[PDB]
Amino acid sequence: MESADLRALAKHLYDSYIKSFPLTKAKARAILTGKTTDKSPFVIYDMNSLMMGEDKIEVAIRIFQGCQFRSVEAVQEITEYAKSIPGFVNLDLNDQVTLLKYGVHEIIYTMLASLMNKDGVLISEGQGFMTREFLKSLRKPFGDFMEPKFEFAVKFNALELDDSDLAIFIAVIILSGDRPGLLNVKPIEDIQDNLLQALELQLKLNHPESSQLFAKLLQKMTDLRQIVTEHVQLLQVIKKTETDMSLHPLLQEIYKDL
Amino acid sequence: MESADLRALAKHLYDSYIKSFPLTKAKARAILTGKKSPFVIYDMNSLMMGEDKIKFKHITSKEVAIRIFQGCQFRSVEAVQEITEYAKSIPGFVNLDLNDQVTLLKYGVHEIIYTMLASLMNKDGVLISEGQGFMTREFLKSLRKPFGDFMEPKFEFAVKFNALELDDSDLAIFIAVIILSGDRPGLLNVKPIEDIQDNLLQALELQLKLNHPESSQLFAKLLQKMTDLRQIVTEHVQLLQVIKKTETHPLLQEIYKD
Numbered sequence: 001m002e003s004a005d006l007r008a009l010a011k012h013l014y015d016s017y018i019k020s021f022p023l024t025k026a027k028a029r030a031i032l033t034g035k036t037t038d039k040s041p042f043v044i045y046d047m048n049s050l051m052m053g054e055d056k057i058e059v060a061i062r063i064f065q066g067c068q069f070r071s072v073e074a075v076q077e078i079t080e081y082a083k084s085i086p087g088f089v090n091l092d093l094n095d096q097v098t099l100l101k102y103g104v105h106e107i108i109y110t111m112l113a114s115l116m117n118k119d120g121v122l123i124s125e126g127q128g129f130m131t132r133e134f135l136k137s138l139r140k141p142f143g144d145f146m147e148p149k150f151e152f153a154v155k156f157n158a159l160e161l162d163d164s165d166l167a168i169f170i171a172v173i174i175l176s177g178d179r180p181g182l183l184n185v186k187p188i189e190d191i192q193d194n195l196l197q198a199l200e201l202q203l204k205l206n207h208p209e210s211s212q213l214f215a216k217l218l219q220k221m222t223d224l225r226q227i228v229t230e231h232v233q234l235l236q237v238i239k240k241t242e243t244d245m246s247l248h249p250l251l252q253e254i255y256k257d258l
Numbered sequence: 259m260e261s262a263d264l265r266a267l268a269k270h271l272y273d274s275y276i277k278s279f280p281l282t283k284a285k286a287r288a289i290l291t292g293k294k295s296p297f298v299i300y301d302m303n304s305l306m307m308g309e310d311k312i313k314f315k316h317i318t319s320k321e322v323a324i325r326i327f328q329g330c331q332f333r334s335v336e337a338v339q340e341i342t343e344y345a346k347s348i349p350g351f352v353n354l355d356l357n358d359q360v361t362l363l364k365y366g367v368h369e370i371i372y373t374m375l376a377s378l379m380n381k382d383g384v385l386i387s388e389g390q391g392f393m394t395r396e397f398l399k400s401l402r403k404p405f406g407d408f409m410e411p412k413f414e415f416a417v418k419f420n421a422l423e424l425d426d427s428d429l430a431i432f433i434a435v436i437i438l439s440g441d442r443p444g445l446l447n448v449k450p451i452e453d454i455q456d457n458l459l460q461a462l463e464l465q466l467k468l469n470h471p472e473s474s475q476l477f478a479k480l481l482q483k484m485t486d487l488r489q490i491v492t493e494h495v496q497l498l499q500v501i502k503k504t505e506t507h508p509l510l511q512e513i514y515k516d
């Protein structure tokens with residue numbers, strides 16, 4: 001509630017976020033813009049360059065399986081970040097699981113934007129860069145499955161948030177009291193109110209020329225709710241066709257109840 | 259510096275909101291709570307008496323559930339016109355590209371109807387006919403085949419939304435923010451719609467602080483409710499689709515086309 005206490009919370013969440021996530025937005029921006037000789041990624045834009053890149057760093061399943069592996073690693077990183085949110089580990093254990101169950105996808109998408117520009121996405125911890133054209137041009141259902149992630153990222157990235165903002169935003173998402181099945185909504189909201197207070201002040205101080213960025217950033221939490229919906233309705237269709245494909249037990253369990 | 263300008267905008271939207279809308283939330287609350295007693299519809303027989311007393315302009319299907327459905331349609335058509343006239347009083351709206359005016363209303367009316375319908379609802383039923391009637395939630399929820407499940411989500415939303423305890427002066431600004439959404443599909447000139455929405459957001463923010471000083475982060479919680487609004491309108495149109503395909507004058511068809 002007091003200003004020094006809110007800045008204190010912001011520093012705690014940023015320092016923790018740096019510790020939980022291996023590749024920040026600031027390092028990703030440095031790789032994506034370039035002018036550097038040491039951080040230059042190998043670019044995959046077609047089938048042949050994908051074969052060479054595996055020596056350096058079916059095709060559509062192999063790329064899909066690559067996304068699965070990272071999303072599982074991301075859920076692990078998000079779970080570790082979540083534990084550091086003051087108050088989270090003190091909630092009813094069922095609500096802990098329930099907040100994570102519905103929060104990871106909205107967060108995975110948000111942080112996936114940090115790795116993208118309009119032309120592609122960083123992979124292999126930034127050693128690689130796979131183009132948007134190549135992904136969107138994958139066959140049958142997989143092409144249309146990759147592109148909405150880019151469509152979201154382009155719009156989210158125009159807000160020009162940095163990592164210090166995202167650490168607080170990611171926390172507000174996790175601590176949503178409107179998830180289905182929560183047992184005690186009140187203590188989750190009390191945490192979110194503080195986190196929101198912390199976000200508002202962080203955004204006011206860090207982005208003082210950006211009018212009403214707080215309101216605009218909460219409205220992006222709208223776009224995320226719908227985009228996760230589309231994602232799970234498209235993934236369900238894809239498993240019905242690709243009898244081979246299987247999902248990591250961690251992702252499996254999140255999607256069992258959607 | 260701009261604070262008085264924002265209170266002026268809040269008063270401008272409040273005075274207009276009273277003129278545009280037949281039954282305010284403050285008048286509806288007095289009816290539902292007790293402080294001219296309305297006619298109560300709880301079942302089939304009392305519905306026939308209510309239409310035989312109150313002149314339901316919409317009655318020419320002999321079935322009960324279709325006749326209630328058709329009553330909601332007729333009132334929604336009136337609300338679209340009420341919202342359309344209120345929109346003209348939002349500073350800057352009439353100066354927009356006529357196509358953008360049409361587009362903002364086309365995509366906004368549903369979220370607004372849902373929002374203001376909450377003003378007429380409590381956990382036990384809904385006001386109709388300018389407050390002269392009161393139709394119970396049990397009766398509506400228990401209508402047959404798809405009609406029961408179509409009525410109830412509106413109550414489930416209203417109960418949660420009304421927990422914020424907004425009054426008409428708050429709602430006048432909130433409604434305006436919705437209309438002026440710069441992300442509607444097909445807008446030709448987004449900038450001045452966002453420029454107006456930024457003003458409206460500032461005015462809502464200060465209004466909510468002055469009017470609700472004990473309610474922490476109510477501004478945030480109110481924006482988070484526009485999440486609930488996009489999703490429930492999505493389900494709503496997918497439910498109308500099932501009702502048009504399973505159930506059923508071309509002129510009447512044409513009036514209700516949207």
Ligand SMILES: CNC(=O)c1cccc(COc2cc(C(=O)O)ccc2-c2nn(C(=O)c3c(Cl)cccc3C(F)(F)F)c3ccc(Cl)cc23)c1
Nearest residue numbers: 062063066067068070071074108109112121123130146149
């Ligand atoms: C051989 N190819 C690769 O190694 C590779 C190719 C392209 C992209 C990537 C990185 O992909 C992500 C990274 C991160 C991260 O580094 O934090 C986070 C997310 C993705 C990513 N999830 N996702 C999904 O579909 C997905 C999502 Cl959103 C959420 C939950 C579950 C899944 C999935 F299980 F079903 F995959 C993507 C779709 C398209 C794109 Cl472009 C990226 C992703 C590696």
Ligand SMILES: CNC(=O)c1cccc(COc2cc(C(=O)O)ccc2-c2nn(C(=O)c3c(Cl)cccc3C(F)(F)F)c3ccc(Cl)cc23)c1
Nearest residue numbers: 314326329330331333334337368371372375384386409412
């Ligand atoms: C003779 N009157 C009746 O028979 C009757 C029976 C029950 C309720 C009502 C009032 O109904 C509304 C009033 C107002 C208002 O006074 O401001 C505003 C909205 C409704 C109302 N729209 N809606 C819809 O379905 C709907 C919605 Cl949400 C949005 C857009 C379009 C539609 C529709 F076009 F498709 F109808 C309802 C569903 C359930 C309930 Cl309980 C109320 C409503 C009158």
